[PDB]
Amino acid sequence: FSITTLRDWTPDPGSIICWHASPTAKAKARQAPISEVPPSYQQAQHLRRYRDHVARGLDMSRLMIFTWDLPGRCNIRAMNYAINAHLRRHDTYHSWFEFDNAEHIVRHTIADPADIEVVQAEHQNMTSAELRHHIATPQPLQWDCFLFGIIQSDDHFTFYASIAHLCVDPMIVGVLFIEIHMMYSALVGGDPPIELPPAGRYDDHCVRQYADTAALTLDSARVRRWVEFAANNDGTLPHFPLPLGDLSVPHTGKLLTETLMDEQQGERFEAACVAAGARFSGGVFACAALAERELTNCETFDVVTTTDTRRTPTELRTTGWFTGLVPITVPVASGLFDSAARVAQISFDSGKDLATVPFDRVLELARPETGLRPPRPGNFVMSFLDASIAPLSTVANSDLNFRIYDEGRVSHQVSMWVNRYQHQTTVTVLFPDNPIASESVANYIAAMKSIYIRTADG
Amino acid sequence: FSITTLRDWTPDPGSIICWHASPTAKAKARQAPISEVPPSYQQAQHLRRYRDHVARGLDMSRLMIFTWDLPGRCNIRAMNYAINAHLRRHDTYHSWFEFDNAEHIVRHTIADPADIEVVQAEHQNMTSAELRHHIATPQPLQWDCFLFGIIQSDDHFTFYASIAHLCVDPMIVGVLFIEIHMMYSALVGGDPPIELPPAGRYDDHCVRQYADTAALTLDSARVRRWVEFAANNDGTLPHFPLPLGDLSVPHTGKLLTETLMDEQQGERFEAACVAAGARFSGGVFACAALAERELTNCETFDVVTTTDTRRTPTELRTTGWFTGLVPITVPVASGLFDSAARVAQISFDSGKDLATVPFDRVLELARPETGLRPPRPGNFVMSFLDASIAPLSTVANSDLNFRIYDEGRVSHQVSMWVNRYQHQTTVTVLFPDNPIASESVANYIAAMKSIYIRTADG
Ligand SMILES: [Zn+2]
Ligand SMILES: [Zn+2]
């Protein structure tokens, strides 16, 4: 729900109890054998980017950081069980990666998950600033790229989780709610550990993804579609359509959050989508496009949006990085919401089949004549998340004050998350911290909101 | 290797020892509970066709029928173990289907595969004609839609297998070679049953396939590609380009086989393909297309060819119907072999990504404005098989006289198999048995062979 920059987090004073991998666990990890399972395309792109930033002296964002609040005194024994069981259950915590001679990514996999163990210790005189630094330390080229802990106050405590994006995606929220919070509540309630269905294996997804992408050629229809999209955006993925200042200097990422609609406005907005022959999501991309139209007078809107490529029951039970990209194109010659939402809905829906084709694969298949290239800083990525019905709902509609923290590290792009909740629809944007980018983003959000409200109140 | 019509099979005299599901296994199967796993699109299409034919009084082909020859006396105990273990190992033998009061296909699944058991009995005084009829009896709407047996002569015996296509596809050959022949050789040598890798589950494939097809819309690129192919062929899949007989009367299927090349012509043909920027397969479709050019003076050649949609290691270890269809289009204006092989190769390779989209899903998504319909009799289907590298090799290059039998039931279409072996390249064609189709097919084959010879030599 709430998304704040880590540097602005002011935890309540209290004792910091933090779980670190044990020395034995670290030794066992170091001697884990090589696996023939590759990194997913998502993991691979991430690891290459992380390597490159390290080589340039830059500190790259690479974490998902959550907290939530509990009353009273934490049962350390129960929490230790919950965390260790969580780590042992999901195979994304059982592998680690490294680059060999050349840029080939090697996977190592711990053979016996029982060897994985984290152990709690108090950070005796750790200050708030030191804790902010500490929680942001995990990085993708260590096996133990995660931290879990608690801040124990007199009569309440706060639980924090910091997990490398390498191992997870937004689905982790729901999973943590069950496997930390519900598990802990069971144990302190006097019950045995909650029984869970078998976890899916992310390794299997990596294997399938490589088999599927290997079946593609430069002339395959889905590849040609990505090629045409990129060619309509100067050989790469779409750039943010407004000036963002000089991105050759490493500004940190800044957050802008805004409420777009209250509950009533949301109901009316969805009704407007339905009347236009679209759904809420179509309206979301229509509003992004019409906002660009208002500020630039463009005829067509191009962006990529993130989507969860899980499909089977087993994948739905799999923790890991399943995010794929859908290429959104919305023609906005008319400037009306109805046609924009209709066509946007078609682009989103028909584009789902393209989300399982990583654009890195397209770049592999492309030749010099194809005229493609990887994006420069300033690319534009959207996301629509329906937190009103998804398991997120259970978290969002829970009494726990669940919070997300951006690490506030160097930013090369604009990420825009539109989130529908039970009682409001909000937008959050992460972007480079300079006055030009701040002005552009602020104007884009203001226009977009005005279009949301205008549509709702027709 | 050899493909014969069942009616023309003359088994050696001997004792017919045949394995039938036991009365207990059949009753237990009858009370198996409903499963939420749907039939695959392939299974579903097949089952609808079989129901429809039965309702129209027609006898449809539905089997894969194989034999091979063994020296000496069959160890009945060892064979019994092998057959039963094969049936228990693969989940395609654990389900059966039926139509409910609606047009919905219901899957039932036996809970404990150990309840599955086949038992041998001698069919005393069964004549050869009675054995031909008997081996052709299995059908897709009974659970035990398979037969296995031996014909024991004085000093040798023949093993026969008749399995509903419902449960298998060509991969079964390799599997039987391991799980019958290799298993049998282990047992009669006194060894334990051979260790096999874990078998894949076809149920999982059905689930995955429905999730994937559900992600498609009429506007998805792959669907639009299938639609354009059908529209480029008068709203359906390609028809055979030569006249046939009156398809409103039920002629049985007829076979035509011809040798295209010897080994030396084969190595030279492949080298020509490689030089032309194509491969053997591209050359195969190039030769079919060029042959149609000489016989019809058409501008482009359109056909569908079969491909194995297995991709992951687990799918490669899964017995079942994975066959999909690739839309092949070859421009044939120039008449040169190099360009035809180039473009045909591109269509084949880039079309692999389309084989996982069932055309029935396209028909679901299509609207009357799309202008499609399910094909009428006379469609044309090719296949290229490389039996020099595939498991077939070991079977093909085995002392065993491995034979395939067509059941000689009603034929509505032309199926063409081009098979490369270590020492020759052959073509087999199944088509409706009337003089008109026989002449058309014969001429087509002659032209095709002549082009093969031209390309291989001078
Ligand atoms: Zn710590
Ligand atoms: Zn029998």
Author numbering:
A (entry chain B), B (entry chain A): 2 to 459
Direct quotes from the study:
We provide an important correlation of a genome‐based mutation to a molecular phenotype across two predominant clinical Mtb lineages of the Indian subcontinent. We have identified a distinct lineage specific mutation‐G247C, translating into an alanine‐proline conversion in the papA2 gene of Indo‐oceanic lineage 1 (L1) Mtb strains, and restoration of cell wall sulfolipids by simple genetic complementation of papA2 from lineage 3 (L3) or from H37Rv (lineage 4‐L4) attributed the loss of this glycolipid to this specific mutation in Indo‐Oceanic L1 Mtb.
The investigation of structure of Mtb PapA2 revealed a distinct nonribosomal peptide synthetase (NRPS) C domain conformation with an unconventional presence of a zinc binding motif. Surprisingly, the A83P mutation did not map to either the catalytic center in the N‐terminal subdomain or any of the substrate‐binding region of the protein. On the contrary, the inherent ability of mutant PapA2 to form insoluble aggregates and molecular simulations with the wild‐type/mutant (Wt/mut) PapA2 purports an important role for the surface associated 83rd residue in protein conformation. This study demonstrates the importance of a critical structural residue in the papA2 protein of Mtb and helps establish a link between observed genomic alteration and its molecular consequence in the successful human pathogen Mtb.
